[PDB]
């Protein structure tokens, strides 16, 4: 019916605003990135600080895991991405080519490829083994806010402050579809649904939308939260009830019934904008993270 997410752990350690949290595919770890130029790794179930991963010259906006949970990629204002070995903490590769801040990144399912999005308005596809850039997509006419592969990696979805969502064929780099929502507020976040059929997109008019990709139709709208300023991550929660999860500029974590669009729970505790949320792959566990006047991560757990 409704979840009952309760605070389990508050994770302190970052010296500046947190930018992104992501659970490892094996569910064992939480990774966090931050304006403090650091990646930190935490136990997903006990909240225990594990290690700090350092090397970027400026703040980090996004981090992402490889399928086997062995690698991380981060996106930095220093114009690079870095591929990291999680167990050692060593930088395996530095991905150079973007001409402005790198803002978002993701591995494909196979994890032989990384996709990046930058303020340079481009989307780049990188070879994980070599670190060389395979393709540069002239994707948008403003900063790229998010990039995400579908469930088999055959497609890429991107979003930009230009007001557009675009779907790209990974193999060729050609554009398959542009989603033009009549009236084009900046699109601050986008990702595929777990089944690859839909796309969840956030726009900077306090609105989340679920689109049918094949048909190009908006099926669901989620409102009631605050989002006009920051690129806040949104999630599909699939482990218990089927929810949509997002942070909010009113310091709250919002949870909606995916189907009914009704707010089912609001998570109170953070003392600044909740910029990032992640949903655990197997357990009813949420991780949330907040900006400059908070700087902490919170782990929450529900019965459904």
């Amino acid at each position: 019916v409704k979840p009952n997410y309760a605070l389990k752990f508050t994770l302190a350690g970052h010296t500046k605003a947190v930018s992104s949290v992501k659970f490892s595919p094996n569910g064992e770890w939480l990774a966090s990135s931050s304006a403090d130029k650091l990646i930190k790794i935490w136990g997903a179930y006990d909240g225990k600080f594990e290690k700090t991963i350092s090397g970027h010259k400026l703040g980090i906006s996004d981090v992402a895991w490889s399928s086997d949970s062995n690698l991380l990629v981060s996106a930095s204002d220093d114009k690079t991405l870095k591929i990291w070995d999680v167990s050692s903490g060593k930088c395996l590769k530095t991905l150079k080519g973007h001409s402005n801040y790198v803002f978002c990144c993701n591995f494909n399912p196979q994890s032989n490829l990384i996709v990046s999005g930058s303020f340079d308005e481009s989307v780049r596809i990188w070879d994980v083994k070599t670190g060389k850039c395979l393709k540069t997509l002239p994707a948008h006419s403003d900063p790229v806010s998010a990039v995400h592969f579908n469930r088999d990696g055959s497609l890429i979805v991107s979003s930009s402050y230009d007001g557009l969502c675009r779907i790209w064929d990974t193999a060729s780099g050609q554009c398959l579809k542009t989603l033009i929502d009549d009236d084009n507020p900046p699109v601050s976040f986008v990702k595929f649904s777990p089944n690859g059929k839909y796309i969840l997109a956030a726009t900077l008019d306090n609105t989340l939308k679920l689109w049918d990709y094949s048909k190009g139709k908006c099926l669901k709208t989620y409102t009631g939260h605050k989002n006009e300023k920051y690129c806040i991550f949104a999630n599909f929660s699939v482990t218990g009830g089927k929810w949509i999860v997002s942070g909010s500029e009113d310091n709250l974590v919002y949870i909606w019934n995916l189907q009914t669009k009704e707010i089912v729970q609001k998570l109170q505790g953070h003392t600044d904008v909740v910029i990032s949320t992640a949903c655990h792959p197997t357990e009813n566990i949420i991780a949330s993270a907040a900006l400059e006047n908070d700087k902490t991560i919170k782990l929450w757990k529900s019965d459904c």
Binding site: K16, A17, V18, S19, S20, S34, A35, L58, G59, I60, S61, D62, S76, D77, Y101, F103, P143, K229, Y230, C231, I275, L291, E292
Partner: peptide, 6 residues
């Protein structure tokens, strides 16, 4: 970075 409005 993402942590600052732009």
């Amino acid at each position: 970075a993402r942590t600052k409005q732009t």
